[PDB]
Structure formats: structure tokens, C-alpha cells
């Protein structure tokens, strides 16, 4: 039909996530990610130990 | 000579056209009907909710 599908097996045996993007309803990727406000606190980082 | 008459040889040559066939091709568009009003309804939903 209208499903483009792809195979990926980081999806479990036994689940379908259907996405949709686009349209008129102008759509797009669904999790939105949050950094912390502190500018030091951003990325992974390396710290010294005790 | 042969004198023959009709309607046919009198006339025109038909404004034939050919339909959209649906052979000889790999893929076939899925038939999607949409009338005016359906898409009044999805543009205007789409704008209330942006």
C-alpha cells in the first residue's frame, strides 16, 4: 500500500512501529531530545577522579 | 467505378482516445479518490492545528 518497510531487527520479534512524515500536517520525527541548560553539562564528558 | 454511400464515408473519423489501460507495466497507482471537501477538511484541519 502506502508503507514503505524496512527491515531492522533493533525493532523486537513481534512489534510493528508504523511512522508517518510529511503532509499537509506537515509531520515530523516523533521523540524530541532535551540537553541540560548548563553549557559544561552538554555532550559526553571526561572528569577528573578523586 | 464503385458508387457506394454512407453515413460512415460521408463522415468523420472518430475522436478516439485510449483509457488509462492498466497492463503492460510493472506498477499500477493505488486509485486514490479525494473530493473538494475532503481536501477543504484536511487543509483546514492542518491549519487550526499548526
Known amino acids: 500500500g502506502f508503507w514503505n518497510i524496512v ?8 512489534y510493528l512501529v508504523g511512522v508517518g512524515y510529511g503532509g499537509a ?5 516523533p521523540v524530541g531530545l532535551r540537553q541540560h541548560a548548563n ?12 | 467505378a464503385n458508387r457506394t454511400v454512407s453515413p460512415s464515408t460521408q463522415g468523420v473519423r472518430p475522436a478516439m482516445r485510449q483509457m488509462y489501460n492498466g497492463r503492460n507495466v510493472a506498477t499500477r497507482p493505488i486509485p486514490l479518490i479525494v473530493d473538494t471537501s475532503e481536501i477543504r477538511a484536511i487543509m483546514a484541519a492542518a491549519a487550526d492545528a499548526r
Open chain 1, 7 to 14: 527491515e531492522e531487527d533493533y525493532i523486537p520479534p513481534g
Open chain 1, 25 to 29: 500536517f506537515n509531520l515530523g520525527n
Open chain 1, 39 to 50: 553549557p559544561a553539562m552538554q555532550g559526553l564528558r571526561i572528569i577528573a577522579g578523586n
